[PDB]
Design a protein around this ligand. Structure first.
Ligand code: HEM
Ligand SMILES: NCCc1ccc(O)c(O)c1
Length: 456
């Protein structure tokens, strides 16, 4: 039994002066480097414990001792994502019901049914880049967010935001992005009730109504028409919980749709953006992955089966998620009094934070070379020690989108590698913006087409 390490406190401000940044995850990773595998962090009226070693993270992932906590960020996102899966407590009836209903629709097998719609959007992204004139460049996270929002829209409720046809996004996208931004901004607001935020409040209400109105209309339209599609909405309207025998109600189905878009799009866009970043910064790795793309994708459009054979593309994407897991922390609470690691007693309710990019630099697991980009670390995923690699969270509260995210990213990155050579024409300096997720802000490249035809 030991005193938990903790950074310097500054009278009433406690540890808060150490996080005066808009990149708190990066800062907390520097604190972990100084303090080690666990530290307490206190700010006026708040306390949490940041874990970073695989040894302790293994215990925190014991579901009989710890369960998902809703951080303040998740509580603010709940104001528009409701009791959708990502923003629900485990004990909520709607959490267990939507989980039992949706899991089969999100399995590896289920990806065979989404593949054609993912290819539809991925062809539109390849065609955009094929049609740029010689002087132009690509804004990488911006295009990847186009792609993932439109893919989730089409797979999720057969709705086309037509993001590649626009300078200004579809009004629903503008409202959702503006809603996310407001939820995150409320975290750092000292006097939330000052009149200077009356406008933020009104706009946030207007953004909720825009989202709810569109999704409720599409649910109402599909119920009126009777039509059966390859989308998550069809599965939700038809499905019954095998436990209770009940289906989801219309309101909840709406929250699941908003949640897939709001929680799924940007993590997945960040993944592709960091992967192409690491590839243009490591040309020998880019060449090996582009070779596999050419060897495997021998048809005008990729089949489901071919995407499964892009093993090296998979390795690149896991190594990007090891260095910069784009949903970078998840929070837990002690179900009962317990002792963590033989040394740190916790009381029922005490919160833990899993600092996922620091977990992923645990030198006892990966070797000393943790900052290096090496997809070859993932050649044999069964050898990796259990709980060492957690970019999709844990247990029953893990990412239900994980197979969908990786199928999309693998398909798209292999098409990109097949169809273009890339140039880091600005010698881009990594700048990791932290919102709900991580992304490489301002990352831009040039793509020179290899002039290889697509199919229709
Ligand atoms: C690379 C992309 C992604 C990453 C890194 C990611 C990561 C995560 C993580 C870490 C969690 C656990 C959060 C927690 O414990 O608080 C999670 C939950 C979840 N994610 Fe993802 N995600 C990604 C893509 C997606 C996609 C594409 C979707 C849906 C289309 C999605 C839907 C969900 C949902 C609904 C949950 C809550 C599941 C539950 O608690 O039952 N995610 N994701
Ligand atoms: N699919 C949800 C993605 C997500 C986003 C931010 C987070 O911190 C996280 O743990 C998970």
């Amino acid at each position: 039994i030991k005193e938990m390490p903790q950074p310097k406190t500054f009278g009433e401000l406690k540890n808060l002066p150490l996080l005066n940044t808009d990149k708190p995850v990066q800062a907390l990773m520097k604190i972990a480097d100084e303090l080690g595998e666990i530290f307490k962090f206190e700010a006026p009226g708040r306390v949490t414990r940041y874990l970073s070693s695989q040894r302790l993270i293994k215990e925190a992932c014991d579901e009989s001792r710890f369960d998902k906590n809703l951080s303040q960020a998740l509580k603010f996102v709940r104001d528009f994502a409701g009791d959708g899966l990502f923003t629900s407590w485990t004990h909520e009836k709607n959490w267990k019901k939507a989980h039992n209903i949706l899991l089969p629709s999100f399995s590896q097998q289920a990806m065979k049914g989404y593949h054609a719609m993912m290819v539809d959007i991925a062809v539109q992204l390849v065609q955009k880049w094929e049609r740029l004139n010689a002087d132009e460049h690509i804004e990488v996270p911006e295009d990847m967010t186009r792609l993932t929002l439109d893919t989730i829209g089409l797979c999720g409720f057969n709705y086309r935001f037509n993001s590649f046809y626009r300078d200004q996004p579809h009004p629903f996208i503008t409202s959702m992005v503006r809603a996310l931004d407001e939820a995150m901004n409320k975290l750092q607001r000292a006097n939330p009730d000052d009149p200077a935020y009356d406008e933020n409040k009104r706009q946030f209400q207007e953004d909720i109504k825009v989202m709810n109105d569109l999704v409720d209309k599409i649910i109402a339209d599909r119920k009126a028409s009777g039509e059966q599609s390859d989308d998550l909405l069809t599965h939700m309207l038809n499905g019954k919980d095998p436990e209770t025998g009940e289906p989801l109600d219309d309101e909840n189905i709406r929250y699941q749709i908003i949640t897939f878009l709001a929680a799924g799009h940007e993590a997945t866009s960040g993944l592709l953006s960091f992967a192409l970043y690491f590839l243009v910064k490591n040309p020998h790795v880019l060449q090996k992955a582009a070779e596999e793309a050419a060897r495997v994708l021998v048809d005008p459009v990729p089949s489901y089966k071919q995407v499964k054979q892009l093993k090296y593309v998979g390795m690149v994407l896991n190594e990007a998620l090891r260095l910069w897991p784009t949903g970078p922390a998840f929070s837990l609470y002690a179900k009962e009094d317990t002792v963590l690691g033989g040394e740190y007693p916790l009381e029922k309710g005490d919160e833990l934070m899993v600092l996922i990019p620091q977990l992923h630099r645990d030198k006892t697991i990966w070797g000393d070379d943790v900052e290096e980009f090496r997809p070859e670390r993932f050649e044999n995923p069964s050898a990796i020690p259990q709980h060492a690699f957690k970019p999709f969270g844990n247990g029953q509260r893990a990412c239900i989108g994980q197979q969908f995210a990786l199928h999309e990213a693998t398909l798209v990155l292999g098409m990109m590698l097949k169809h273009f050579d890339f140039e880091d024409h600005t010698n881009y300096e990594l700048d990791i913006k932290e919102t709900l997720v991580l992304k490489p802000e301002g990352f831009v490249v040039k793509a020179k087409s290899k002039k290889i035809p697509l199919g229709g």
